[PDB]
Each structure stands twice: as C-alpha cells, then as structure tokens.
Design a protein around this ligand. Structure first.
Ligand SMILES: [Cu+2]
Ligand SMILES: [Cu+2]
Ligand SMILES: [Cu+2]
Ligand SMILES: [Cu+2]
Ligand SMILES: [Cu+2]
Ligand SMILES: [Cu+2]
Ligand SMILES: [Mg+2]
Ligand SMILES: [Mg+2]
Ligand SMILES: [Mg+2]
Ligand SMILES: [Mg+2]
Ligand SMILES: [Mg+2]
Ligand SMILES: [Mg+2]
Ligand SMILES: [Mg+2]
Ligand SMILES: [Mg+2]
Ligand SMILES: [Mg+2]
Lengths: 334, 334, 334
C-alpha cells in the first residue's frame, strides 16, 4: 500500500459534502479522514433537549466520499473530556463488526482504522460499543454516512452515465426524549443520567423526535437548502435505526437507489421511496420549477409533528406547460 | 471547478506569511483556508485590556496568499463558546458585500465561502455583521488581509519583475478602550458589557491605542523583526478602519503600492506612504545598512504614545559611503 | 527552497508511526509538522500520578519520519491555558542548541523552526527552556523522536538493503515522583507546585517510574503490540535522560543500531542492546515464532518494578525445529 497515493480530506458539516470528483481522477488511493467525538447537549426543539454524543460535533456525522477500490483510513479521537467509550462500525467495510471490534476507545484515546471500500454505494457508519450501548449511542446521535462511488461515476438502469451538480446529505435521526406526564420533555446533566429514563421511551419504539441535521427546523426557514432550476441534486438519505420514506413534495426521484447500492438498477419517477433503518439510500432529481419544495419523511405526522421536514428554495423561471393555475381561488362569501 | 487543482493552506500568525510562490507554479487553483473565530480579552499594554474578537486568535487575522485568477474557499468557524454572530467581508471579492451577506454564523455554526480572486493586490478582509456591529467588531480586532499576487509575480513601474525574500504583514489596528476620569482604562467581563462605554470613545474618533500585531511593543524588543543586509522585504500594511502613514525610519520604500493594487505603477523612493482606512498597501525595501530600524505610523504621537511602532534588527556590514559619523558627539561641559 | 516540494504530515500517537516510505519517492522535500504542547496530570500507575508536560498530548511525543537531505519545518504551539514557557531541541539539527535557542515560546505563542536533516538516524527531540528547567521538563514528559532515513532506505553491515513492515516507537521515560515516608506517591495541583519535591527525588538519580508510552502497563494486556510470524519489525527506542538496555524476550535484535545512526554498521544477533540517555536507537527483528514476547529494559527491576515492560502478541504457526518441549513439567508430589 506504500505505492498507493494518499489523499487527506477535510470534512464539511452536513447536509453538505466535502470536495470530490464523481469520476475517479486516478487509480485506487488511500483516503485519510479524521473525526473528533463530541459529547454535548443539543436543542432538538423548543423546550426539547438531547444529551447527545456525536461524530465531529454534528448530527448526522459528516459525509465521507471515496471511490470503489479505494482504501479508507479513519483516525477517530475520543477527547478526555468525554465520559464514555466509543467506536465505529462502517457498513461499507468487511470484518470485525464493520470495524467496531477494532476501534473501541476510552476518553483520552485515539485509533486509526483502515478498510478497503470494496462495494459501491451509500453506507451508514455508526457507534456500537456493545450490548445495550449500541442502540443508545446511535439514538443519541452517533451515526453518519460514507458514500463509495463507482470509479467511473454513477450509472442509470441502462448503464448510461449520470452526474449531479450538488450532493445534499440528509441524515435522519430518531430520538427518544423522556416525557413528564404532561407531555413536556426531561433534561439531564449528562448522557448517563438520562439513560434509564430514555430506555423506557426506547422500549415503546415511538420516537419523541425524528429530525434532519439534528434538530427540528434545522433545514427550514433560514436553513432552507438552495438550488436552481436545472440543477441535478443527489439527496443521500441515511437512517441508522429506523425506517423512513423520503419524498420531495413538488418533485420526484428521477433515479432512486432506495437500498443505496449503486451497481443495482435505480428506479425512476418515484413519488416517495424507502430507507430501511440501518441503511442509506440516494435519489437524484433535476429541478424543473422554481419555488419552495418540501423534502420530507412522508409519514406526515413524523414530518410535521416529529420534525422530519426540510425546505428547498429553488430559483429560476416558472414553466406553465408543467403546471398552471387556470382559475385562481375565487368565490363569494358572507 | 472539479477539474481545477485544490491546495490546502496552513496559515501562520502575523507578522509572518504562510509558504507560497511569488510566481504561480501552475494554472488557476482552488485555495482552501480555515479560520476559527476566537473571542478573548487581550492585553494591549500595561494596565490596558481589550475584550477582543479575532480571526484565528490573532490581531490582525492571518495573511492569506493566492494568485490572481485562483479561487478562494474559506471555512469560517464560530465555536459554541463564543457569544456573538460573526461573518467575513473580503475586499478582494465581488458580490454579497464581500461575502458578508453569505457568511453570518452564530456561535456553534460554520460556513464555507468561495470567491474568485479576479483582482491582484493586498486586500483587507474583516467582520461586518451589520449595522452598529460593523465598526465595533472591526475595532475589537476582527480584520486581516489577503494578498492576491499577479500570476507572473510583482512588476515595477516599467514592467520589470520584482521579487522579495521575505514578507512581513503589519496589521495596524485602532482601538477605543474606555477611560476613567484619571486616564486609566476600564476592564469588562465580556465584549457586550463594554459596548456602550466603547461606543462613547468611538464617537470621539480618537483611538486609545493604535498597535501592530495586536499590542503595544508586540514587534519591539524580543519581538523585533529580523533581516539581513541585502534582503528585499515586502511590508504589507493593513488598516481596516483608520488611516495610517507607514515609514521605515533609517530606510525607504523602494517600490510602494500605497493603495495596494499590484497592476498599478508603484512609486519609488518614498520616505513615508499612506494606507487609507479600509485598505492594505505594500512597500518593498532592500536593506543596505545593518542596525536597528523603526517601522512606524509616522504620526509620531500615534507611533510612540498610541503604540504604532515595530523594530527591525538587521545584520550585516556597515557602508560608510552611505553614512558616516565624521565628528562624534563632543564638547566641554560643566 | 521555494522550488522544493512541501509535504504536510499528520502525526499519529506512539508507539505507532505516521505513513511514510522507506525509500524516498522523490528528491529533497520540506516536511511540515505541527505539535501542540499539553500540560496535564497523567496516571503513571495505580496511585501514582505525574504533573506532565507533553508534546501533542502523549509521552513520548509523536514520531516524525523524514529522509536525509530533507528539510523539517515544525510549528510548535504553546496554548494560553498552559503555565510555563517551552521550546524544542532537535538532536537531528545543527545550531542554536538544536533549535532550542530559537523556539522559546510562552503560553499563547507559536513558533516555526526549519532545519535541514543532514544526518541519517533516529534522534531525540526534547524541551530545554534553560537552566534547571531543562531536566525538569524532560522528566515531566517532554521528549520524543525524529527518524531520518537514508534516501535509499536502511542498509545492513554489508550495504544490503533492509526493509521493515512495521515501526514501533518505544519511548522510554524516567520519572521522579515524590514519595511520602511510607512509599506512597505525592500529588500536586500543577507542575510548579511539585517542583521542589521532585528536585529532591531527581537528585537521588533513582526514578520512581520508568515507563513505555507514558504509563506502567501502557503496552501490556489490551495495549499489547501485535505482529505476525514473518513480520520485520523496527523497534525505535528513545530515552532522553537515562540509559536503557532494550531486549526482546523470546527473540533477538537481528540488526541493531544501538547508537541509532543508520550509516554506521549495525550489529547482529543481539540479546540486549544499549540506549544511551539522550539518544534513540533502533533494532530490527523478524518474528519466527508465534506467542507472547516481552520487550523490556533488561534491568529486570526497572522492567517489572518500575514499569519498563511491553508485550508483543504474535500470530502464526509454531516451529518445533527452533524450540520444543521434549518433556513437559512432570513429577510426583505430596
Ligand atoms: Cu458512542
Ligand atoms: Cu404528499
Ligand atoms: Cu465579528
Ligand atoms: Cu521621521
Ligand atoms: Cu517544556
Ligand atoms: Cu532475559
Ligand atoms: Mg476536524
Ligand atoms: Mg416538564
Ligand atoms: Mg430524467
Ligand atoms: Mg487553524
Ligand atoms: Mg481606573
Ligand atoms: Mg532599487
Ligand atoms: Mg495535531
Ligand atoms: Mg501517601
Ligand atoms: Mg536475518
């Protein structure tokens, strides 16, 4: 491997993706990444907080992008200020529980894992210390995604090359914040203190919150995603613990790999697709109309009550051939 | 832009400059920079403190160096420990108030701005959140410089190539620390607390301190700059809010671009030049004599009472043809 | 030097080594390294603590690897939270006390030193502020190693090329923790407070602890080093202040440069070698048998009572030709 090129990557926070090339500009390389585990309380919504544990300080953890055949070398750091052991499980990797069996680090320790990205597709990576700690760390926010692109870029159902202009990584996460009898949420001093109460909520399998980018409304309003008519946007969607059903209200999924593995034929013209808990999928869409769109988990209760809604603001010219208000809302009243 | 090379730069603290090449060793590239905003109290002088806000923990912010035609991608980070929103305005950029309208980040947020460095010259970059916050953040220390070199290096008034051996970035900053009736300076717990009192001083337009590298005497004594006879030193001087009149006591400005834009003809043999508030200029000088030099803002009150003085210690052999003490101080007394 | 390639390195914690090539893949380059000085109390053993001062948060400081003829540019950072001045002395460098006279930085300061690695070999680098501070900072943990490989890789006593599969940097450090009359160890709030008491122990020249990787048992048990039969492992051993006598129990030193300078002929088949205090040496060994090995300072009291013991777990097939239990422990008793 000493004869292989090495590339150091600088991760960017979700929903954005670090600089990369869709078509590998060279042969296999060793991709170097680094992440610092950060334990901190985060505001999921008004009067709703989570004693979170995160990869690099964000929920979801940052998106890593490499090419099939490349190697991935991740330096994982657990700062001394943290309270618990952590590790990492790459669904894109082969062996040792995705790397989990070789990356258990206590506060104050670091580890470097190398694995060969032998299979193309978007994959989930997440913490999994062992036993009950596995689901707890994940629902506390410790999960992200790594996208392994085919060396010759994405291909459609006919083998034709497809390209995107922008990648938006939508990391959906389900959380189980304990509630008082009146429905209000509980707050704790640290992750450990709220464990017992959180387990009770987890056992009901009913999330208190289901969010994109770690908080209700994170990608709405001023945080709304941007695009222009004509843009081919690849929406990579991950859900490490629970199913989701992504939909771009106002648009469609032109090409969709709901199971997220690129060598499989993608489906076309979907209104809503399905992301299995414990996986990442991808949908490509070319914007044809300007305006506001709503990217959601299409169980509308989960989208609106739980928080699984993002907004996309698209600039450009309107096309009346596709849609037109023939008769505007009108009528007498009293 | 995916076909353009990417170069990751590691910034060094002022008055020094990160490694670079005067003549572009290749075609246009995308220059990647990262800075962390740091809010902290700094000692401007004995018994004089400033609740500062800085780019990367220094005043001035670090110097960025790229070439005309290149792109600049800056990752700006506002850590959660900070108290206020911040952003960045690049005078070298075109649009959105220099980037200010696209980089407003609250504590705990990050942003990445890309702009094309279409014009050669030294430019100021500074924070400008909006309204009254603009001058306040700047005089609190949030300003630096980015130098955009012509792809074929610097040229003189005749178009002849000129080269420097060393670059010293002198960031001059004016501060307005509140005073008690006896002239002593006030101290506060954080930036916000001292705002009202600082505004009163700002309104007088009289700085309490005018310093190089963020403190009185920062570049004097043990912090004195070093050089050798024969060295061609480029003194890049910035002042984001108030005029300055740089002068190298003991020397001159061999070639000077006081308005700081390299495609303009530089002036020669200056004794003192002028840096307009809100700009950066550059002066090149070849040392001919060893000894101590004083680089100052030539309003001597501002240089000595306010703090605008730096020292340069030059090693080498003395040249009697240029200057000689014919008769040493002598005389009877009583 | 502007015409020389620049390579940015990411250091990894000891006993591991950052990615590198044994044979220089190109002509001379400028190697860029960065380290943050961290002052923190560390647990040397059960009920034994050290108010440590470290390079990059580890003891020993991380291993730097470059090639003879290259230049080394180290950015040293002394964060504002630290309490004392620090600097760095590279035994691999020429002039200014190894760089110590040009790198004295107070808390809140940074410095960048460049030196030419003109001589091949493993060298110690350590803090040396001046006077009594020199030994104190070193025995507080401020020492590491830089390995300068010949451009054409390592060579044996006959000039034949030798290669290793893995490098393990064993940084041995002697500490002098004050003891109560009953033998128990004292604890302090910061380095300065325990200085006077530590000096008394230092004067006896008897270390309370002698450890690998900064703590008793750091590289034993779960921290045991790993290897496979057939692996050529290079054990680089440093001791900045006191002599050590490394030995690989169960194996040997196939090729050993105990004085650590690669152009000198290495010795073969050693059972134990010698590392002079203030130096780094290197020993290469090819594992022939699977099982547990003990890498130790062969003054067994220092190895077992003081802490100088590391374990190596080797996987592979056993070779009865080399060793076999002909008659297992047997006999009548009562
Ligand atoms: Cu975890
Ligand atoms: Cu719908
Ligand atoms: Cu600001
Ligand atoms: Cu004058
Ligand atoms: Cu030190
Ligand atoms: Cu023995
Ligand atoms: Mg990072
Ligand atoms: Mg309540
Ligand atoms: Mg289509
Ligand atoms: Mg930085
Ligand atoms: Mg007073
Ligand atoms: Mg001239
Ligand atoms: Mg580091
Ligand atoms: Mg005791
Ligand atoms: Mg042999």
């Amino acid at each position: 491997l000493s004869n292989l090129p090495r590339v150091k990557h600088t991760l960017v926070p979700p929903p954005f993706a670090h600089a990369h090339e869709q078509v590998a500009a060279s042969g296999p390389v060793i991709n170097e990444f680094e992440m610092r585990i950060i334990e901190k309380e985060v505001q999921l919504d008004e009067d709703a907080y989570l004693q979170a544990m995160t990869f690099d300080g964000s929920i979801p953890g940052p998106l890593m992008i490499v090419h099939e055949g490349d190697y991935v070398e991740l330096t994982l750091i657990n700062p001394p200020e943290n309270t618990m052991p952590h590790n990492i499980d790459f669904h894109a990797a082969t062996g040792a529980l995705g790397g989990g069996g070789l990356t258990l680090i206590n506060p104050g320790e670091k580890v470097v894992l190398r694995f060969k990205a032998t299979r193309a597709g978007a994959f989930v990576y997440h913490c999994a210390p062992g036993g009950p700690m596995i689901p707890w760390h994940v629902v506390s926010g410790m999960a992200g995604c790594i996208m392994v692109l085919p060396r010759d870029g994405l291909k459609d159902h006919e083998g034709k090359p497809v390209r995107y202009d922008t990648v938006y990584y939508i990391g959906e996460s389900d959380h189980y914040i304990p509630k008082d009898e009146d429905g209000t949420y509980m707050r704790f001093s640290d992750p450990s203190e709220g464990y017992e109460d959180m387990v009770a909520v987890m056992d009901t399998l009913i999330p208190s919150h289901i969010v994109f980018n770690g908080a209700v409304g994170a990608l709405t309003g001023e945080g709304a995603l941007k695009a222009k008519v004509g843009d081919n946007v690849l929406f990579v969607h991950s859900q490490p613990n629970r199913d989701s059903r992504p939909a771009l209200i106002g648009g469609h999924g032109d090409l969709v790999w709901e199971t997220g593995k690129f060598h499989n034929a993608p489906e076309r013209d979907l209104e809503t697709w399905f992301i299995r808990g414990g996986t990442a999928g991808a949908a490509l869409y070319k914007f044809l109309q300007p305006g506001v769109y709503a990217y959601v988990n299409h169980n509308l209760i989960e989208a609106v009550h739980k928080g699984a809604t993002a907004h996309v603001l698209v600039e450009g010219e309107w096309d009346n051939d596709l849609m037109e208000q023939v008769v505007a809302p009108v009528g007498l009243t009293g």
